[PDB]
């Protein structure tokens with residue numbers, strides 16, 4: 001079976017040895033003057049009669065992907081960064097002996113450099129008549145084809161062969177710096193806040209712990225910059241944002257990765273209603289720049305980011321997707337506990353009325369939110385950093401928004417109430433001691449920072465990785481992350 | 490003494506309570522239509538005769554910094570994001586009672602919003618004739634002045650008061666996205682590689698360790714993306730870069746921070762000589778855009794980034810700054826060990842000839858490199874990822890470059906030699922077991938990735954934080970990092 005593959009490994013190493021007993025092995029002096037796209041966008045419209053008479057020399061380098069050897073001439077496909085180009089490897093277009101003694105002896109996946117002139121084949125294809133041809137790196141292993149997880153264990157392979165996957169990560173990088181251009185253009189300053197916090201705060205999840213060996217001190221890997229960005233606002237950086245990693249112990253998932261990219265952005269003298277008018281206007285502007293169209297296919301669905309997003313209260317969503325729901329039960333703890341238990345929810349000792357009304361929303365409405373939707377009016381019990389609402393103080397001015405069943409973003413009117421912020425970190429701590437290992441920590445510092453005066457403000461957080469998925473039609477986070485986290489072996 | 494300061498804390502809280510028994514406390518509905526800079530760049534050239542007759546209403550919000558109360562009118566300095574502006578708080582320009590019952594009762598540091606029309610005072614200063622005036626957040630603590638380290642423990646204060654410090658962090662953000670515009674313009678793709686590696690590699694330093702609670706797995710906080718960026722090159726991302734954090738256990742320093750920002754950039758089919766022609770051309774382009782001039786003051790020195798950097802071999806630097814040095818001693822281990830011991834160096838059991846020749850360079854020449862300098866020809870023993878040199882294999886094609894006594898950057902021709910890369914990870918491991926806890930780990934994966942073929946390449950790393958220091962004349966890393974790491978209490 002596949003021991004003529006171990007014939008390949010062996011044979012390549014013996015080749016590499018003899019190159020080494022010459023000096024040829026691993027040279028770095030070759031210089032190319034074009035990539036593959038730059039020849040195609042400059043010369044595809046030209047036919048042979050033009051290209052033969054134009055007589056353009058070019059130098060290129062890449063990974064040899066095919067080789068038909070027709071005798072005294074061959075045909076080599078060279079793949080580099082911008083695609084693939086065609087080589088015409090003639091015996092007597094090369095210097096005496098390169099064709100028979102070097103070119104024939106090279107394997108696929110090897111790195112070659114080529115110099116020659118452009119033309120068009122019988123096909124009409126753009127090809128390089130090679131006149132110098134060089135080996136640049138000996139590939140000791142041959143190109144693959146397997147496992148569906150090789151693409152994550154060895155992403156270098158998936159980038160070489162799959163082009164969906166390659167153009168996905170080129171769209172990712174366009175997206176990231178398209179978000180920035182939009183965020184600056186609005187007047188925001190990209191800051192860098194610490195990824196090693198000593199008290200982790202700003203979201204509700206289990207952090208990674210590490211020990212600083214020079215200060216006897218245990219640090220945490222931040223679960224959000226939220227507490228620290230809000231410090232900068234008090235400082236008078238009144239339009240800050242930060243697109244960077246964060247770290248949560250959540251398991252390896254298809255909506256989760258223990259390290260993931262998130263933007264957070266805070267805007268002074270503005271309320272959450274202004275964060276909607278930017279979430280909407282962002283996703284429209286990203287859809288237009290990345291895709292040329294407000295309308296975006298994703299899975300079996302199509303989303304229209306030109307069209308305004310749907311918007312419901314949390315209670316509206318429940319009574320919409322569970323219409324038999326006696327809405328009075330969201331008002332009394334025992335009735336809410338019973339209601340939650342009846343639809344499957346296991347209500348914990350550490351749950352109060354708003355958490356039950358939330359965990360019931362989570363059951364009943366969430367995955368049904370498929371067109372982009374905002375869900376406003378979150379309970380206070382679950383939103384320890386959001387402002388309280390003016391007409392009803394047991395609910396915050398906080399929206400989460402959803403596209404296709406997942407939470408993308410989370411924003412709210414911010415809590416510029418020092419004292420109330422302290423007492424809500426108390427409830428979180430009372431909550432951890434009741435058995436909630438995702439409760440917050442009391443950040444005695446952040447509470448001080450508020451006492452110095454935090455201007456009324458509203459802030460937003462948006463999972464970039466989830467959003468990268470929407471614009472590349474990828475359905476696992478492990479497909480928009482270059483090196484996604486592995487369950488090992 | 491300072492118990493009329495605890496009179497201030499008490500008095501502010503009692504104020505905030507009575508606002509709360511009204512509803513006024515923490516409103517968020519105020520909207521401003523200008524910041525302070527936008528009034529100054531639009532109306533400073535105008536005199537009163539123009540501004541009185543133009544009659545421009547404006548709304549602004551900020552932190553009240555001063556208040557002269559002259560009786561039936563006052564003068565208030567309002568500081569917001571873009572600077573400070575002047576308010577003319579008249580009694581009868583405000584709605585009945587705001588002046589006597591609200592405006593007088595507000596403290597400094599409070600967040601007010603103001604609406605009014607522009608004019609010029611007797612001074613000729615640009616001021617707002619207030620006609621609506623509102624309290625937006627009650628500051629429970631008053632503005633400071635202390636300790637020289639408060640600026641790092643509570644950076645929100647240092648941004649409010651010190652303006653050197655504020656404009657330093659605004660220059661930082663201009664620098665970061667000026668590097669990107671220059672890096673893209675050259676044709677590089679900003680990627681995101683994992684900050685949680687399972688085998689940390691790519692530099693020589695002690696990493697942070699953490700445990701992933703869902704996979705029984707111990708992760709490390711990456712000390713560089715170097716191993717992973719080079720994977721992406723093999724994939725055919727032949728121009729990648731990444732400006733992001735990394736993490737080392739190094740102590741809290743003035744050239745170090747346990748988390749710090751670094752760019753790394755890899756370029757296919759190019760050698761380290763091409764990384765110089767970009768280090769030079771970067772620092773020139775950054776000096777020109779950030780400062781308007783190729784010449785940069787820093788400390789007692791002045792650097793000229795228009796002028797080409799000085800360049801020495803490692804041995805040239807030694808024999809220049811220790812001219813009596815018998816250069817034959819850099820060739821024999823025992824003579825090099827004796828030479829090192831004589832200038833103070835304590836040579837370890839795990840040191841070979843090149844490490845001694847390096848640690849001797851480190852003693853003898855390094856801090857004398859003040860004008861921007863390149864130091865080429867590093868020994869192999871200390872450069873496990875660099876390519877070997879063609880004429881002498883015991884030295885790599887690796888330069889480190891220095892400005893003003895510190896190492897800024899580190900680049901080299903990259904090692905596209907699979908087998909040699911494996912045997913050099915062996916020496917590193919033999920080295921850890923000899924007593925070097927900054928030796929590398931054998932990354933059995935990275936070795937495979939090379940076997941698939943790494944095109945000849947050259948890569949560079951540049952400490953951004955150190956470089957931010959050069960362009961803001963700041964001399965501690967703790968002054969270009971928003972929240973620098975604290976020795977606690």
Ligand SMILES: NCCCC[C@H](N)C(=O)NS(=O)(=O)OC[C@H]1O[C@@H](n2cnc3c(N)ncnc32)[C@H](O)[C@@H]1O
Nearest residue numbers: 202203224226256257260408409410459460461463
């Ligand atoms: N001041 C407004 C709130 C700002 C952000 C807030 N502090 C926060 O972190 N909210 S969140 O709901 O925890 O996260 C925002 C987004 O992060 C994304 N996220 C969270 N955990 C992960 C994981 N594990 N992988 C990928 N993406 C993730 C997801 O899209 C969330 O909607």
Ligand SMILES: NCCCC[C@H](N)C(=O)NS(=O)(=O)OC[C@H]1O[C@@H](n2cnc3c(N)ncnc32)[C@H](O)[C@@H]1O
Nearest residue numbers: 691692713715745746749897898899948949950952
């Ligand atoms: N392939 C070329 C090499 C690329 C970079 C290489 N892997 C590397 O990390 N080299 S380095 O010398 O370790 O770091 C580059 C710069 O990082 C900076 N650095 C390193 N540690 C710290 C700390 N602790 N604080 C601040 N800046 C730091 C410093 O400017 C170094 O010159």
Ligand SMILES: Nc1ncnc2c1ncn2[C@@H]1O[C@H](COP(=O)(O)OP(=O)(O)OP(=O)(O)O)[C@@H](O)[C@H]1O
Nearest residue numbers: 203204205248250255256359362406407408410438
């Ligand atoms: N205490 C909890 N009990 C049950 N499920 C929970 C709890 N906390 C979080 N989850 C669930 O964990 C999953 C992770 O979902 P997701 O990351 O999209 O957002 P989330 O509900 O806001 O959580 P987080 O606070 O981790 O961001 C969700 O299905 C979420 O409801």
Ligand SMILES: Nc1ncnc2c1ncn2[C@@H]1O[C@H](COP(=O)(O)OP(=O)(O)OP(=O)(O)O)[C@@H](O)[C@H]1O
Nearest residue numbers: 692693694737739744745848851895896897899927
């Ligand atoms: N094994 C060692 N023995 C003595 N000093 C060392 C050793 N390793 C690093 N140092 C010193 O630690 C300090 C940290 O310096 P710096 O961060 O500027 O660059 P470096 O010498 O290349 O180290 P690193 O590998 O940590 O980046 C330097 O003064 C450096 O020489």
